[PDB]
Amino acid sequence: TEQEDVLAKELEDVNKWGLHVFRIAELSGNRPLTVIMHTIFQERDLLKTFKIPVDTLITYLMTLEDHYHADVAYHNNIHAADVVQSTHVLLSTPALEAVFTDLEILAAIFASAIHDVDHPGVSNQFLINTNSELALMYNDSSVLENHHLAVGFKLLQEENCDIFQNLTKKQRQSLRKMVIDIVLATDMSKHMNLLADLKTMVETKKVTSSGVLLLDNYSDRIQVLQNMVHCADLSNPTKPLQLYRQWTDRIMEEFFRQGDRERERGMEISPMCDKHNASVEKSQVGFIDYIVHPLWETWADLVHPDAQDILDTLEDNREWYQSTIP
Numbered sequence: 067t068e069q070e071d072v073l074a075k076e077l078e079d080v081n082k083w084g085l086h087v088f089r090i091a092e093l094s095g096n097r098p099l100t101v102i103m104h105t106i107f108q109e110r111d112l113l114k115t116f117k118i119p120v121d122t123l124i125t126y127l128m129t130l131e132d133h134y135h136a137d138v139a140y141h142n143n144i145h146a147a148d149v150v151q152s153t154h155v156l157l158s159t160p161a162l163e164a165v166f167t168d169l170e171i172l173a174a175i176f177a178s179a180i181h182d183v184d185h186p187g188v189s190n191q192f193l194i195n196t197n198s199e200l201a202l203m204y205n206d207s208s209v210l211e212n213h214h215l216a217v218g219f220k221l222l223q224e225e226n227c228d229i230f231q232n233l234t235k236k237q238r239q240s241l242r243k244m245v246i247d248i249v250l251a252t253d254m255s256k257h258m259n260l261l262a263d264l265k266t267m268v269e270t271k272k273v274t275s276s277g278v279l280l281l282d283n284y285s286d287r288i289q290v291l292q293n294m295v296h297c298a299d300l301s302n303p304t305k306p307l308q309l310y311r312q313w314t315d316r317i318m319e320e321f322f323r324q325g326d327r328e329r330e331r332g333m334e335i336s337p338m339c340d341k342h343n344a345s346v347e348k349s350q351v352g353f354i355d356y357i358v359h360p361l362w363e364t365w366a367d368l369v370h371p372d373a374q375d376i377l378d379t380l381e382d383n384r385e386w387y388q389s390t391i392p
């Protein structure tokens with residue numbers, strides 16, 4: 067089949083920054099997370115290493131993917147597939163060669179896959195301000211992130227979905243802890259603290275003669291994995307412009323829908339959520355200057371000079387967005 071052939075060809079770029087993820091979503095019948103996760107697991111030999119039955123992996127992935135909302139413009143299965151694939155590329159950074167174990171690799175990829183599952187398309191602050199059941203359950207802290215974790219793990223208990231069935235008890239405990247530590251770190255309210263700690267690691271950085279990072283204890287290892295997945299989460303502005311612009315269109319649609327809910331409820335409209343008073347291009351330049359560039363520049367220092375091409379693209383995109391402002 068032509069559709070199946072073109073999908074296979076697009077998936078050959080799975081190890082590259084700038085994978086045509088939207089095209090893959092279309093060609094796979096809206097199954098980018100399932101096909102990209104399966105491809106990556108095969109590429110890294112994770113099914114054999116952890117004795118994961120192929121049917122079990124696909125069943126879990128399809129179930130997980132079904133729990134991403136198809137009517138949420140940004141925080142959906144395409145975003146999850148994109149973060150998974152971006153983490154997969156970051157794990158292959160020369161400076162991290164042989165740094166992480168297969169279990170740590172599995173944890174980072176799994177964390178990426180479930181990190182926004184069942185996202186309702188509204189922010190933690192909106193959930194807190196509307197006295198939502200989610201904010202009540204989670205006592206106003208990392209409300210969404212706790213929920214994404216709970217759903218991602220609970221789905222492993224569905225029929226033929228336990229992809230970790232052949233891991234030892236110790237491996238399962240370690241993976242669970244790492245996944246929780248990683249997904250909770252994707253809460254944007256923790257960004258400044260995560261970045262501050264990453265900068266501290268860079269200053270005291272220890273490397274081999276080839277530039278490979280030397281991370282001994284759990285605190286340092288998980289910190290790098292947390293920042294890696296956080297970078298993947300915040301990687302849209304570092305992708306080829308055609309991809310970045312699509313992600314911007316999607317987050318603005320999602321944000322505007324939240325603002326529409328806020329406006330009708332008589333709530334103050336959140337930043338970037340007012341479709342009648344928006345400055346999309348100025349907001350992207352601000353996002354890059356204050357959040358994305360500071361993070362990626364620090365990551366680039368940690369793995370110097372492996373992230374130079376990513377940083378170059380980010381700066382090209384910032385320049386272009388700035389040029390659209392008269």
Ligand SMILES: CCOC(=O)c1c(C)nn(-c2cccc([N+](=O)[O-])c2)c1C
Pocket residue numbers: 252253254299300302303310313314317338350353
């Ligand atoms: C593609 C442009 O993206 C954005 O402008 C943008 C802004 C601002 N915040 N966020 C955002 C919102 C919730 C969570 C995260 N995240 O955890 O990375 C990022 C995005 C994706």
Ligand SMILES: [Mg+2]
Pocket residue numbers: 181182210252253
């Ligand atoms: Mg999130």
Ligand SMILES: [Zn+2]
Pocket residue numbers: 145149181182299
């Ligand atoms: Zn995300």
